[PDB]
Amino acid sequence: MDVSILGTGLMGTALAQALIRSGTKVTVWNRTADRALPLAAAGATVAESPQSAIAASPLIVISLLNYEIAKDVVTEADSIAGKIIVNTATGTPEEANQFAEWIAGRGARYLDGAIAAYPEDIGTESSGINYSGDEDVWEDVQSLLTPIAAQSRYVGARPGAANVIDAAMAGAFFNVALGAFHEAAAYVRSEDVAIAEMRHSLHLWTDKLLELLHEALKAFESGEYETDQATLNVYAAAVEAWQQSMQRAGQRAALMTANLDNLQRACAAGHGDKGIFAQIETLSAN
Amino acid sequence: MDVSILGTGLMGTALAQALIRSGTKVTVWNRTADRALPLAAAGATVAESPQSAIAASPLIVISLLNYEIAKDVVTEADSIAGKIIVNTATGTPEEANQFAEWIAGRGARYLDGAIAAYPEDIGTESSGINYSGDEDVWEDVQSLLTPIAAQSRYVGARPGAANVIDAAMAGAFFNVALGAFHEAAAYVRSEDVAIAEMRHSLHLWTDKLLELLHEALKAFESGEYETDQATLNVYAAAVEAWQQSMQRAGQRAALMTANLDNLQRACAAGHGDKGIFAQIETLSAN
Numbered sequence: 001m002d003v004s005i006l007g008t009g010l011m012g013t014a015l016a017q018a019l020i021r022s023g024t025k026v027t028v029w030n031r032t033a034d035r036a037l038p039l040a041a042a043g044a045t046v047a048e049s050p051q052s053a054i055a056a057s058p059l060i061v062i063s064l065l066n067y068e069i070a071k072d073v074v075t076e077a078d079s080i081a082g083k084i085i086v087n088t089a090t091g092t093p094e095e096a097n098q099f100a101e102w103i104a105g106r107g108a109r110y111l112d113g114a115i116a117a118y119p120e121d122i123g124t125e126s127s128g129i130n131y132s133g134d135e136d137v138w139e140d141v142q143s144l145l146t147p148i149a150a151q152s153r154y155v156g157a158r159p160g161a162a163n164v165i166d167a168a169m170a171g172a173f174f175n176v177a178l179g180a181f182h183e184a185a186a187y188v189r190s191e192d193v194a195i196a197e198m199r200h201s202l203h204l205w206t207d208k209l210l211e212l213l214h215e216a217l218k219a220f221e222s223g224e225y226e227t228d229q230a231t232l233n234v235y236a237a238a239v240e241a242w243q244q245s246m247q248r249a250g251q252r253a254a255l256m257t258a259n260l261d262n263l264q265r266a267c268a269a270g271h272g273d274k275g276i277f278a279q280i281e282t283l284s285a286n
Numbered sequence: 287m288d289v290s291i292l293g294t295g296l297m298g299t300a301l302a303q304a305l306i307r308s309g310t311k312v313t314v315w316n317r318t319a320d321r322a323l324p325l326a327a328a329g330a331t332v333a334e335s336p337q338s339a340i341a342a343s344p345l346i347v348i349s350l351l352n353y354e355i356a357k358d359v360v361t362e363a364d365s366i367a368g369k370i371i372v373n374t375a376t377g378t379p380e381e382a383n384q385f386a387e388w389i390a391g392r393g394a395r396y397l398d399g400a401i402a403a404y405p406e407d408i409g410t411e412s413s414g415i416n417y418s419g420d421e422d423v424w425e426d427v428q429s430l431l432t433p434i435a436a437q438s439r440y441v442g443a444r445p446g447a448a449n450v451i452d453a454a455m456a457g458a459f460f461n462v463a464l465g466a467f468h469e470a471a472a473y474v475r476s477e478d479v480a481i482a483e484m485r486h487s488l489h490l491w492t493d494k495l496l497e498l499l500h501e502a503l504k505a506f507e508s509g510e511y512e513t514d515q516a517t518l519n520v521y522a523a524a525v526e527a528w529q530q531s532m533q534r535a536g537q538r539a540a541l542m543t544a545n546l547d548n549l550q551r552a553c554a555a556g557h558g559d560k561g562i563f564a565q566i567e568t569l570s571a572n
């Protein structure tokens with residue numbers, strides 16, 4: 001099954017190159033189009049227009065900045081009836097649900113994607129894509145698309161599920177954890193200790209974190225938050241002492257302050273004697 | 287060189303077992319002492335008293351709850367002159383600096399340690415210990431102690447350096463990042479998406495985080511925060527949109543809120559067009 005890609009940015013380009021290597025015939029389009037020139041040389045067909053790119057293939061993969069631009073570009077096709085549209089842009093769950101419904105009312109099939117991978121990672125081990133929406137669609141494009149990522153997974157029937165997980169993992173987890181590390185290193189530097197002496201431990205701490213994340217998920221699935229060892233109360237106390245150390249050292253320590261606040265509410269609602277994972281129970285706004 | 291361990295808790299016990307396996311003669315003491323019974327069977331000598339345990343060995347490794355208890359126990363020796371004292375308790379840098387000075391005034395040598403490893407990890411790959419204080423001491427105990435952790439490192443002349451790095455990595459980074467993951471999963475669940483569909487990506491995200499941490503450290507060492515790709519401004523905007531999504535979904539999102547605040551201050555102080563690592567520059571209380 002041939003495919004066309006709308007968007008030859010870094011990601012779009014990477015998608016196109018992986019698909020060529022798969023042995024798939026690829027047509028590309030891009031709003032500028034100088035950008036798509038090199039892809040021509042690798043085996044791709046450059047199209048004059050979205051309409052023309054859409055018409056060329058049964059499967060259209062979108063890699064454009066956002067959902068609004070995606071909508072505007074695919075509006076320029078007169079017909080998409082019978083086509084499979086796969087939109088790999090990041091965005092809100094609502095964006096996905098609405099895009100899905102618009103696609104469906106034009107007589108096209110839809111699947112929504114979210115890419116956890118730098119462009120340069122796209123053909124390799126260090127690359128995953130989550131997909132959500134109609135499972136029948138996923139079944140029809142799995143073999144064609146699974147090549148372009150090591151770990152490709154259908155994560156739910158809701159069009160917006162991939163976008164929810166991507167926000168959660170890239171935003172709520174990853175970006176915040178990256179910030180936490182800035183607070184950490186700024187703290188070390190404030191105590192006149194060499195930031196370099198953090199370096200050799202990094203992999204030990206990210207390994208430990210991975211094992212803990214697995215364990216937190218098991219506990220969130222279970223409702224089993226029971227002791228083991230350090231309780232919420234112990235953690236709350238330890239975090240307060242860390243916060244005070246960081247402040248005495250001249251750091252605002254805002255993430256550490258927010259963490260303490262999460263821990264206290266968990267304790268203050270009677271979970272003080274359960275394990276740290278029980279902190280999940282008071283993250284809601286109530 | 288024989289060693290005595292004060293404290294046969296889980297950690298103390300683990301230290302003792304590794305040292306026996308090293309081929310070192312070990313004497314142990316513990317305040318209760320039923321606890322130390324099994325260690326007898328593995329090859330260790332149980333001592334009646336701290337004084338007696340101290341007298342038995344040139345090198346004393348402390349694994350007691352905190353610095354206060356450590357001080358009180360070693361006060362019970364009449365003499366420690368000429369002994370090497372290695373205190374592996376976690377605590378503040380000030381605790382370390384003061385303990386160091388007290389040890390020195392009793393005519394003993396000192397090194398301070400911080401253990402990044404669960405007890406069960408102590409003899410294995412997944413285990414590191416940082417040491418700080420007098421480098422001459424480290425040189426004299428390196429071969430004897432390096433066995434009991436895969437990655438053992440001297441991290442500075444300040445007695446308190448190991449305690450600073452441990453607070454930074456265990457507290458400011460790790461505990462907060464673990465909290466961030468609770469916010470993430472609570473968010474996914476709030477959007478009626480299966481928390482299970484986070485699981486398969488975990489290792490990809492902790493791998494990506496590790497590479498990013500390395501890169502942040504390189505940038506903190508350099509002062510080179512320059513573009514590349516996504517700027518502080520883009521991040522601030524993306525984080526606001528994540529925060530709004532999480533709140534609309536009924537989550538407090540306190541860590542995400544604190545992260546945004548860090549990002550805005552960086553932008554609001556004219557770093558908006560540099561890369562994310564420039565956020566380090568406004569973490570101070572000012």
Ligand SMILES: Nc1ncnc2c1ncn2[C@@H]1O[C@H](COP(=O)(O)OP(=O)(O)O)[C@@H](O)[C@H]1OP(=O)(O)O
Pocket residue numbers: 006007008009010011012030031032033035063064065069073
């Ligand atoms: N307003 C718009 N209309 C149509 N396509 C747009 C667009 N804004 C961005 N794109 C496309 O969306 C894709 C995303 O590009 P980007 O600037 O976000 O980064 P990158 O090139 O790294 O992917 C590109 O294919 C881009 O095409 P251009 O080369 O014409 O910029």
Ligand SMILES: Nc1ncnc2c1ncn2[C@@H]1O[C@H](COP(=O)(O)OP(=O)(O)O)[C@@H](O)[C@H]1OP(=O)(O)O
Pocket residue numbers: 292293294295296297298316317318319321349350351355359
């Ligand atoms: N007040 C105190 N005086 C002396 N030793 C103490 C102490 N509190 C704790 N310890 C020791 O400090 C060590 C830390 O024990 P812990 O209760 O913190 O956890 P774990 O047993 O997992 O290491 C133990 O060797 C403990 O000895 P006990 O078996 O007598 O509890």
